[PDB]
Design a protein around this ligand. Structure first.
Ligand SMILES: O=C(O)[C@@H]1O[C@@H](O[C@H]2[C@H](O)[C@@H](NS(=O)(=O)O)[C@@H](O)O[C@@H]2COS(=O)(=O)O)[C@H](OS(=O)(=O)O)[C@@H](O)[C@@H]1O[C@H]1O[C@H](COS(=O)(=O)O)[C@@H](O[C@@H]2O[C@@H](C(=O)O)[C@@H](O[C@H]3O[C@H](COS(=O)(=O)O)[C@@H](O)[C@H](O)[C@H]3NS(=O)(=O)O)[C@H](O)[C@H]2OS(=O)(=O)O)[C@H](O)[C@H]1NS(=O)(=O)O
Lengths: 189, 189, 189, 189, 189, 189
């Protein structure tokens, strides 16, 4: 019983100002979990979408700027796809862009420019070995939609060039999911 | 955002015994409401299936017998489709089968025989005028999935021939519904 | 169990003379209810025609004159289709013809001439809102044949030029209906 | 104004037990009249189906058993079509099956088996001469739908083999009729 | 007598400022009535457009900004189509965008960006049941153009992200209507 | 914004009796103005049809008789088309029919006979020079729909033969007009 749908979530991210003169970059990570998109249900149905299995097909991360088009001290960054839960260490002012030479690098124009990334994440099945599957719609694993313990999906790391002014963003993540085995429970009343 | 699914519900019905010698029939009615198939949800989602609109496409009423194949004093009844909320009055021992000459009559062999009816019900929009639409999948009205006040659908009346022995049935109603406008709400936690 | 047929009825209508010199017109509406055409039945069958449902297809109004051809003080009037049960106000002698400019106007010669109209009426579901359907034979609704509470249909209003003489007509109505769901009941005797 | 419809009626028939050891048969007759299917009407319409003429096209006699499938002392009988109102004399325990060598004989398995007969009856126009028409849909006579004096149609005789146990049946006769000349009368009220 | 035309109306909407730091959204509703587009007439014609019936085909809601392109603290919202008169409750600072996961969601870039929505509304025939028709130009109901009591059409709800600065808009609603039955009345003078 | 419609108006005309023995004719004129067909509007809309420009395409003058078919002293007259506002002088009993030799003469049978004239009128732009355009639908001038000062259109003159009895007529003029530039004004309320 397949049901392809779309789930979204919005949150903020700010790159604080720095008095540093050099071009330094701010590094951070981004994971994706389905608990943040799918709330708990009620009653005999533990989740709000009554299905048993799921598998995330795609994610769309949108960096919607919060800064005016008149803001100066512009910069240039990079967003890369990291499917293994080993990101570059979080840094405030690093002397280089680590994600620049990555094959999945897209340039981030800053601060007042929109940046989208559309990709297929991978689940963290074993963080010790960090193995994942290649892209195959027919062979992608089905995970279970747990009650409160779903596994973290992974796949984006960023590097933003710091500035004299604060750079704020409203990040909207949209997960395109595919469920299976409609499992609604209908007790009496 | 269409989602065709199937919702079921099971309950009992008994035709008590009678010392009456004549062939008399027991008349009863059967309505269908979605509150009995779809429970209330939890939180910002008032229902367990997160959709706004619905329209019932078909219903399958199954009379599953509870009586052995050795039971005697067998009989013959009738099930008809009544799409207007004006049934023959409920009777214990009526001297005739009212639903026999109906164009939608199917014979009910009793007591140990299975009887199915598959039809398209109609909602009770105005019980004073009792108007309904003909069968058209493209023009069928969309109703709202209310929180605790959904409208009764209608469409089956029965007439069972009484017997010296009690005739029990387990009735399984299956509604084939079609929802629209996925409306999940995801507050923070 | 479809059954197309024809029903009719006859009654009188008169236009009393007026000493007024100006061209004045007399206004009156016309409703249509089935209880006037279909008497009650007898016994278990509340109506003489054993069906549950109906839906009117067409109506044919016939203004049969009662007057001679030699009558003078001839005039001219109009009739129009009105599907809301909010007609022009009834009037004796109005200084203009309200129904003249309506798109559904058919001229009326007076006093000794035949006049006919052939159209689709509509019912009165909600007199507050006064809504209905366009002409469609497939999507027309099915009403219930009540015992003593059928709904009034609508669809004609008139305007007759007054005169010095009394103008009397014999009005014949004819309905073309379509029943369904043969519902005869055969108790013993 | 033709209207083909279907009228039904249900009643009982029992073959009482006998201590006789031999194979004996119980003979009985079956006539069909429209008064038993069509009740009287009400008011100016003397009958409940407002038509003038009729002619019976077919009849379906169904012997629905009342006995369990575990009942022993089974037997074998015969049902024949007798279109002339001269049946074999009614007998309780006759030493042979009279209807066995009839060209219209169908075997009746007893007691827990269903038996149907579908045929075209004939009216009793003159019981002295006992003449009837062959089967012709285009040339079949139209009779009048009288008020309380309709003519008996004829066409089935049976022979049931007696048993130590009582053999009960619920007999459902269905007449497929064809009316003509819709004659509804609509007085005022 | 069909006449397709276009009626417009302009009004303001402001999202007041908030000292709240989090991303919160301001929720509001939008209904459409023809009294706000069609004024009352004069004399025997109760309305300024001399027709009897109407049905709204489409509506174009245009959010024309009032804010400069240099305004900061930008945001992202959502507009959805709600055809049933049960909107999300009006809120000043809600912790999430309720209309984000709706199938009819369009993103609203704020504050200095234009947003249009072009859709087919539905009338509020019964607010208790909240039923409406699917899109069909041939089967769309004709309503009556009342004098001062027309029914509210429905179909848009919004969610705007709050800001430190006031966000003003000039909203221009354009209804594309279709009238019927030209009913001009021409008394003497 | 073109809108072709039809506007009507009804009024009386009587040819009084004369004791004169000779055949004499009664001459009269007939002009057409849009103020007599289109009333004043209300509010910011000065007219009831909300358009700016107009041009009259055709006019249908219908002489509906008021006299019985038994009336004697019958006669013969003439109706001609006069597109220049210089009619034959109005006369009570003229010794000849002036409009008889006109190329646009149609015979008027009197008194109980219907007479129609269907033609294209012309406006009175300059009564001193009396110039008009030939018939061309594509090149016909657009006039302005003034508030209370529209220009008179012209085009019919008549000659009725007098009689011992009074000859009354109900004259129905129908103008087929074509408007342009829908100019509805919708202030607030
Ligand atoms: O059915 C009854 O409850 C009952 O009916 C009558 O008694 C007979 C039985 O019905 C009859 N059975 S059968 O079903 O016909 O087979 C039979 O057994 O004989 C009995 C006795 O008859 S006898 O006495 O004549 O011998 C009787 O009514 S009457 O015959 O009309 O007088 C009453 O006893 C009773 O009817 C009354 O109640 C119903 C149900 O409402 S409730 O009672 O409040 O629960 C009333 O229904 C009202 O109107 C409808 C409607 O017109 O659609 C609804 O109105 C809402 O929807 C419209 C829009 O409609 S639509 O266009 O979408 O289709 C809105 O525009 C309205 O604003 C809505 N109403 S509001 O917002 O609440 O105001 C709604 O169900 C209800 O609304 S309300 O009550 O008007 O508010 C019914 O009208 C009333 N009878 S009446 O006499 O007042 O007409």
């Amino acid at each position: 019983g397949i049901f392809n749908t779309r789930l979204s979530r919005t949150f903020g991210y700010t790159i604080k100002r720095t008095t540093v003169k050099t071009p330094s970059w701010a590094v951070d990570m981004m994971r994706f979990n389905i608990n943040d998109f799918l709330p708990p249900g009620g009653g005999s149905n533990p989740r709000s979408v009554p299905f048993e299995y799921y598998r995330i097909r795609k994610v769309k991360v949108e960096f919607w700027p919060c800064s005016p088009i008149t803001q100066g001290d512009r910069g240039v960054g990079s967003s890369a796809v990291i499917l293994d839960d080993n990101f570059v260490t979080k840094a405030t002012a690093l002397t280089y862009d680590p994600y620049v030479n990555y094959s999945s690098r897209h340039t981030i124009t800053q601060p007042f420019s929109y940046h989208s990334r559309y990709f297929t994440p991978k689940p963290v099945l074993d963080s010790t070995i960090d193995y994942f599957q290649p892209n195959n719609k027919r062979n992608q694993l089905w995970l279970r939609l747990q009650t409160a313990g779903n596994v973290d999906h992974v796949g984006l790391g960023t590097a933003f060039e710091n500035s004299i002014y604060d750079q704020e963003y409203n990040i909207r993540v949209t997960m395109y999911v595919q469920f299976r085995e409609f499992n609604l429970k209908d007790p009496p009343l």
